[PDB]
Motif scaffolding. Structure first.
Motif, PDB file in Angstrom:
ATOM      1  N   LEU A   8       0.813  -1.216   0.000  1.00 48.85           N
ATOM      2  CA  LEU A   8       0.000   0.000   0.000  1.00 48.85           C
ATOM      3  C   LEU A   8       0.840   1.256   0.000  1.00 48.85           C
ATOM      4  CD1 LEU A   8      -2.655  -0.887   2.732  1.00 48.85           C
ATOM      5  CD2 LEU A   8      -2.733  -1.317   0.270  1.00 48.85           C
ATOM      6  N   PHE A   9       0.358   2.273  -0.701  1.00 49.20           N
ATOM      7  CA  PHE A   9       0.835   3.631  -0.477  1.00 49.20           C
ATOM      8  C   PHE A   9      -0.205   4.382   0.337  1.00 49.20           C
ATOM      9  CE2 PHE A   9       3.826   2.791  -3.922  1.00 49.20           C
ATOM     10  CZ  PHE A   9       4.957   3.412  -3.432  1.00 49.20           C
ATOM     11  N   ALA A  63      -7.318  -3.128   4.684  1.00 53.44           N
ATOM     12  CA  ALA A  63      -6.738  -1.858   5.112  1.00 53.44           C
ATOM     13  C   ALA A  63      -7.230  -0.702   4.245  1.00 53.44           C
ATOM     14  CB  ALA A  63      -5.224  -1.928   5.086  1.00 53.44           C
ATOM     15  N   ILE A  64      -7.262  -0.915   2.933  1.00 50.74           N
ATOM     16  CA  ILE A  64      -7.756   0.104   2.015  1.00 50.74           C
ATOM     17  C   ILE A  64      -9.208   0.457   2.317  1.00 50.74           C
ATOM     18  CG2 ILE A  64      -8.400   0.604  -0.354  1.00 50.74           C
ATOM     19  CD1 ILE A  64      -5.963  -0.979  -1.240  1.00 50.74           C
ATOM     20  N   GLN A  65     -10.051  -0.557   2.429  1.00 50.74           N
ATOM     21  CA  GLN A  65     -11.470  -0.334   2.648  1.00 50.74           C
ATOM     22  C   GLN A  65     -11.737   0.396   3.971  1.00 50.74           C
ATOM     23  OE1 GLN A  65     -13.001  -3.580   4.514  1.00 50.74           O
ATOM     24  NE2 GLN A  65     -14.524  -2.185   5.407  1.00 50.74           N
ATOM     25  N   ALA A  66     -10.887   0.172   4.969  1.00 49.66           N
ATOM     26  CA  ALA A  66     -11.083   0.785   6.281  1.00 49.66           C
ATOM     27  C   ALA A  66     -10.400   2.146   6.436  1.00 49.66           C
ATOM     28  CB  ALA A  66     -10.596  -0.145   7.363  1.00 49.66           C
ATOM     29  N   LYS A  75      -6.586  15.643   8.562  1.00 45.81           N
ATOM     30  CA  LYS A  75      -6.530  15.193   7.173  1.00 45.81           C
ATOM     31  C   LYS A  75      -7.232  13.854   7.008  1.00 45.81           C
ATOM     32  CE  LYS A  75      -1.623  16.564   7.007  1.00 45.81           C
ATOM     33  NZ  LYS A  75      -0.361  16.178   6.314  1.00 45.81           N
ATOM     34  N   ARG A  76      -7.680  13.570   5.790  1.00 43.61           N
ATOM     35  CA  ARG A  76      -8.180  12.244   5.466  1.00 43.61           C
ATOM     36  C   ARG A  76      -7.111  11.463   4.717  1.00 43.61           C
ATOM     37  NH1 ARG A  76     -13.287  11.334   6.790  1.00 43.61           N
ATOM     38  NH2 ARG A  76     -14.675  13.129   7.129  1.00 43.61           N
ATOM     39  N   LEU A  77      -6.826  10.254   5.187  1.00 43.75           N
ATOM     40  CA  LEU A  77      -5.845   9.403   4.527  1.00 43.75           C
ATOM     41  C   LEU A  77      -6.306   9.015   3.132  1.00 43.75           C
ATOM     42  CD1 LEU A  77      -4.670   6.926   7.325  1.00 43.75           C
ATOM     43  CD2 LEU A  77      -3.721   9.156   6.682  1.00 43.75           C
ATOM     44  N   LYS A  78      -5.353   8.944   2.215  1.00 43.35           N
ATOM     45  CA  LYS A  78      -5.580   8.350   0.910  1.00 43.35           C
ATOM     46  C   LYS A  78      -4.793   7.049   0.876  1.00 43.35           C
ATOM     47  CE  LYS A  78      -5.303   9.399  -4.057  1.00 43.35           C
ATOM     48  NZ  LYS A  78      -6.461  10.321  -4.231  1.00 43.35           N
ATOM     49  N   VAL A  79      -5.494   5.922   0.873  1.00 43.15           N
ATOM     50  CA  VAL A  79      -4.827   4.623   0.889  1.00 43.15           C
ATOM     51  C   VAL A  79      -5.020   3.918  -0.442  1.00 43.15           C
ATOM     52  CG1 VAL A  79      -4.474   2.473   2.129  1.00 43.15           C
ATOM     53  CG2 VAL A  79      -5.335   4.492   3.337  1.00 43.15           C
ATOM     54  N   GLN A  80      -3.915   3.442  -0.999  1.00 39.80           N
ATOM     55  CA  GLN A  80      -3.858   3.047  -2.395  1.00 39.80           C
ATOM     56  C   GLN A  80      -3.018   1.805  -2.612  1.00 39.80           C
ATOM     57  OE1 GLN A  80      -3.923   6.494  -5.676  1.00 39.80           O
ATOM     58  NE2 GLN A  80      -1.910   5.514  -5.426  1.00 39.80           N
ATOM     59  N   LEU A  81      -3.554   0.861  -3.370  1.00 39.48           N
ATOM     60  CA  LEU A  81      -2.794  -0.326  -3.721  1.00 39.48           C
ATOM     61  C   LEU A  81      -1.661   0.066  -4.662  1.00 39.48           C
ATOM     62  CD1 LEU A  81      -2.821  -3.266  -2.955  1.00 39.48           C
ATOM     63  CD2 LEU A  81      -4.345  -3.720  -4.881  1.00 39.48           C
ATOM     64  N   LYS A  82      -0.481  -0.496  -4.437  1.00 41.27           N
ATOM     65  CA  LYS A  82       0.635  -0.323  -5.362  1.00 41.27           C
ATOM     66  C   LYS A  82       0.648  -1.447  -6.397  1.00 41.27           C
ATOM     67  CE  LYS A  82       5.586  -1.017  -5.757  1.00 41.27           C
ATOM     68  NZ  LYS A  82       5.979   0.327  -6.264  1.00 41.27           N
TER      69      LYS A  82
END
Length: 82
Positions: A8-9, A63-66, A75-82
């Motif tokens: 994840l990024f 983790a991404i979905q949550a 701030k709101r996290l931006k969670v992204q699959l690499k």
């Protein structure tokens, strides 16, 4: 670093978060095998984004979905699959 789309990024981190901080925040979704916050090597200041690896892609997906959109430090996290 490990498997798959198990990496994840994370963007919009609190600038004060370090490696351990990001590791503990993402361990609730499974076994984190590496976690890193990227820093400016002149100032040693966080670049407010980092990297997390699980030992399986389902953890990363959870983790991404949550955590994508999760608010912390105004701030709101931006969670992204690499």
């Amino acid at each position: 670093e490990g498997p798959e789309g198990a990496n994840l990024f994370i963007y919009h981190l609190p600038q004060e978060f370090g490696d351990q901080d990001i590791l503990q925040m993402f361990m609730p979704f499974g076994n984190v095998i590496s976690a890193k916050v990227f820093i400016d090597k002149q100032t040693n200041l966080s670049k407010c984004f980092g990297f997390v690896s699980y030992d399986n892609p389902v953890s990363a997906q959870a983790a991404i979905q949550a955590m994508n959109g999760f608010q912390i430090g105004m701030k709101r996290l931006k969670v992204q699959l690499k």
